[PDB]
Amino acid sequence: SPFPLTSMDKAFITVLEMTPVLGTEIINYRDGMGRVLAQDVYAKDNLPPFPASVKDGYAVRAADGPGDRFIIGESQAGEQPTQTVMPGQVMRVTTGAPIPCGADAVVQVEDTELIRESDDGTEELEVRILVQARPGQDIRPIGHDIKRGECVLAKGTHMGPSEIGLLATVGVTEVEVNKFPVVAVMSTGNELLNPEDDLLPGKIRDSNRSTLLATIQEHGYPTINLGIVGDNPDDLLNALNEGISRADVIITSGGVSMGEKDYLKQVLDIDLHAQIHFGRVFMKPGLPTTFATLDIDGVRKIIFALPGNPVSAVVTCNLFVVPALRKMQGILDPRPTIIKARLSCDVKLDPRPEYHRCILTWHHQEPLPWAQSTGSRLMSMRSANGLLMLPPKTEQYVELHKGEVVDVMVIGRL
Amino acid sequence: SPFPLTSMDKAFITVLEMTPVLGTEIINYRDGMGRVLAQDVYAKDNLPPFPASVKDGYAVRAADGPGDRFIIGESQAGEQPTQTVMPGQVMRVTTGAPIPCGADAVVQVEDTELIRESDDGTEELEVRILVQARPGQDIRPIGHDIKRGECVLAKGTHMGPSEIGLLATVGVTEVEVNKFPVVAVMSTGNELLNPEDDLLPGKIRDSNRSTLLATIQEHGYPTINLGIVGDNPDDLLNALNEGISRADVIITSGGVSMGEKDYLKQVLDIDLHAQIHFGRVFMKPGLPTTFATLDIDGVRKIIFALPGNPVSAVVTCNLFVVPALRKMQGILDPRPTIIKARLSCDVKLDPRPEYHRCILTWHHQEPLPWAQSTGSRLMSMRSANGLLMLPPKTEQYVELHKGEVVDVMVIGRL
Ligand SMILES: Nc1ncnc2c1ncn2[C@@H]1O[C@H](COP(=O)(O)OP(=O)(O)O)[C@@H](O)[C@H]1O
Ligand SMILES: Nc1ncnc2c1ncn2[C@@H]1O[C@H](COP(=O)(O)OP(=O)(O)O)[C@@H](O)[C@H]1O
Ligand SMILES: [Mg+2]
Ligand SMILES: [Mg+2]
Ligand SMILES: [Mg+2]
Ligand SMILES: [Mg+2]
């Protein structure tokens, strides 16, 4: 228009408030990594489902006290015992094996001495119990860990390996979860060639599509590659329509400044009939970043039209796109994790809040990590795992110094 | 034997020193996420490959100074200009467009006023240049960002989205990288049922296989599911042989304590002829953790025989297995990231170093995160992202208090 300059705070809130939560689907539990449960999950069995030994040793009668005992048999893992332990008797048990009838405590083998074994030494016959067992000692009673009817996982849980293990434990192998967003990515510009191409006069290779797709894929979301689209409204409209058909989210880059051939905002508004919620953001980099929604038949499509500059594209993708995707896949608090870190070098502040990729590193016993802006030798073997978030300058603060504590958004595994 | 108690420090060093680095393969650059480069990568072109405008504005002759100028045409993105800018003339340019011959500076549109346009207002004809351009201002010379022949990525680089983008930029679409390890996982025990099974007397469901496979998959490595193997040496040998054939790494759980039917160490040694480097570790949990190598025809297979207890299995998988896998896939320093955090509650120290899953959380402006051991309500919607690493007790230190700073290994995205 030019569009109003939107504050970072308002732009971010706007993205999260306007982004929908996707519907649900049933998945196999093995496919649950990174998913959010859309149901409560209940145990249908006790864990353990039988009284289980905590130790390798002997199932005893505590009332017998210490002394010499005949071993009447063994309770082996996976087998329900058939014998009853009577006074003066014990049964061998291993960890996790059921406690036989008649026994009420377990004595670990270290608190015993073997008296007699078979001639071939493969079977124990008599044992000395050296201790007075406490009632129920070293036994896990039925349901000690999980009770039948217990809710073991609540709706809203963002699942990792241990949650998958818990689903396996309780035998709930199919679960309702939020869908993952399908994200389509296109690049724009008459100057762009594919990465596979040799250069031609006036041209460069398209890097944003690769960087953006890789960023989305890193977070586990399925993607669609919409290729390179030229700087003309008909082609852009057609590509956007393909993205809308095939995906939940459409990400473009380029064509959003006020240049003569920057057409995307016009197309989104007049041709696509989308609602542009902001078209400029007071931030460095990322001034022309644009966010739109399009509602079709009760479905809300999300569109991010990111700046063409490759550094701007990847920065704004991490600030705006990834949190939106997290909300779409059902994460209750989709905000990224922000940590405190020490600046590795002096930095000049801008009237705009500034963002820059960095690497976070912990130094021996020092409590806070150091943030080193990208762009020594070994400090190039690691990919960026942070985004420095620097405040706007003020009459007082014009520069931040090495050692000062700043906010860093986590964008890679630390 | 029982095997000697190995210190945590020695066990860890032993795993890393004895674990091999896998060989290399050529991959498509799009598949590069998490891979380590095994070659240096060089640019074969300049970036930019032509002198490129930094701004939307006009290509001018600085020697003309400010004044009124005829616009002879436009340099559009993706097109090599054909006209030469003469004294008194300018050419329209957009960001990233080539600078035409004859021009030596760019003046951004904000430093101009339009004098004359075509009757239909689609073409600019005359413009007032309001400033004295500095020589070469707002032009990116050829090779400003990347020079032909420049090494843009070094061997040893662990790649993320920005590295993939750089490969795309320089048109290096196939790259030599280290292979990823293929990891086979089996569970052991006569008491185990599949997750899909209803319970039978004396039985429980196998959770470790799911938890371990999910842990490995989370780090991006391919896996093989070897199922449930009974407590007998013939079956265990056959399953191990299948794992050796199909995978680089074999992970078992269960059968490694001194119980009667704990057979794995015997099988590894006498039947498989593997070299067991440790069979007990002075740690809590994880006492019976076992690490072996097997060298066949100049190939080293790695075997981790983890404890059967499900908490022990997942803890030791994170402490020993994941760092080994990182070394195998070529990461130069495969050690996990260890951060400092404040204990959320008092904790009792053990003679053994203790490890427990936790959740790391940052509180408003407080510099250090808090570590809350797993096992409020909302503090159950998030999966564990840390492993608390508590020191052995001493005559002095028997307990750690809420607020005290401890080491936490990162195991999930923060
Ligand atoms: N895959 C598994 N899933 C769940 N529990 C298991 C699994 N494997 C073993 N366990 C349980 O862990 C405990 C220890 O099993 P065991 O095979 O004796 O381990 P170890 O001998 O290595 O200590 C037993 O209670 C057993 O039932
Ligand atoms: N996919 C891409 N890969 C690499 N560079 C790009 C890409 N898209 C745009 N650029 C470059 O970024 C700069 C800005 O492009 P432009 O389309 O004008 O973005 P905007 O109008 O959003 O600022 C130009 O130098 C352009 O060549
Ligand atoms: Mg463009
Ligand atoms: Mg532009
Ligand atoms: Mg067992
Ligand atoms: Mg055992």
Swiss-Prot record, chains A, B:
Cited function: Microtubule-associated protein involved in membrane protein-cytoskeleton interactions. It is thought to anchor the inhibitory glycine receptor (GLYR) to subsynaptic microtubules. Acts as a major instructive molecule at inhibitory synapses, where it also clusters GABA type A receptors. Also has a catalytic activity and catalyzes two steps in the biosynthesis of the molybdenum cofactor. In the first step, molybdopterin is adenylated. Subsequently, molybdate is inserted into adenylated molybdopterin and AMP is released.
Regulation: Inhibited by copper and tungsten.
Residue ranges, annotated region (MPT adenylyltransferase): 1-414
Entry keywords, A to Z: ATP-binding, Cell membrane, Cell projection, Cytoplasm, Cytoskeleton, Lipoprotein, Magnesium, Membrane, Metal-binding, Molybdenum, Molybdenum cofactor biosynthesis, Multifunctional enzyme, Nucleotide-binding, Palmitate, Phosphoprotein, Postsynaptic cell membrane, Synapse, Transferase
PTMs per UniProt: Phosphorylated.
Catalytic activity: molybdopterin + ATP + H(+) = adenylyl-molybdopterin + diphosphate; adenylyl-molybdopterin + molybdate = Mo-molybdopterin + AMP + H(+)
Residues of the full protein shown: 351 to 768 of 768
Homology family: In the N-terminal section; belongs to the MoaB/Mog family. In the C-terminal section; belongs to the MoeA family.
This protein's record includes keyword NADP: no
Pathway as given in its UniProt record: Cofactor biosynthesis; molybdopterin biosynthesis
GO CC terms, sorted: cytoplasm; cytoplasmic side of plasma membrane; cytoskeleton; cytosol; dendrite; dendritic spine; GABA-ergic synapse; glycinergic synapse
Any Gene Ontology biological process: neurotransmitter receptor localization to postsynaptic specialization membrane
Species per Swiss-Prot/TrEMBL record: Rattus norvegicus
Cellular localisation: Postsynaptic cell membrane; Cell membrane; Cytoplasm, Cytosol; Cytoplasm, Cytoskeleton
UniProt cofactor(s): Mg(2+)
Expression tissues: Expressed in tissues including spinal cord, brain, liver, kidney and lung.
Protein's membrane topology: Lipid-anchor
Protein name per the record: Gephyrin
Highest taxon above the source species: Eukaryota
Outcome following mutation: residue 12 to A: Reduced GLRB binding
Assembly mode: Homotrimer, homodimer and homooligomer. Interacts with SRGAP2 (via SH3 domain). Interacts with GLRB. Interacts with GABARAP. Interacts with GABRA3. GABRA3 and GLRB occupy overlapping binding sites. Interacts with ARHGAP32; IQSEC3, INSYN1 and INSYN2A.
Enzyme nomenclature, EC number: 2.7.7.75, 2.10.1.1
An annotated Gene Ontology molecular function: molybdopterin molybdotransferase activity
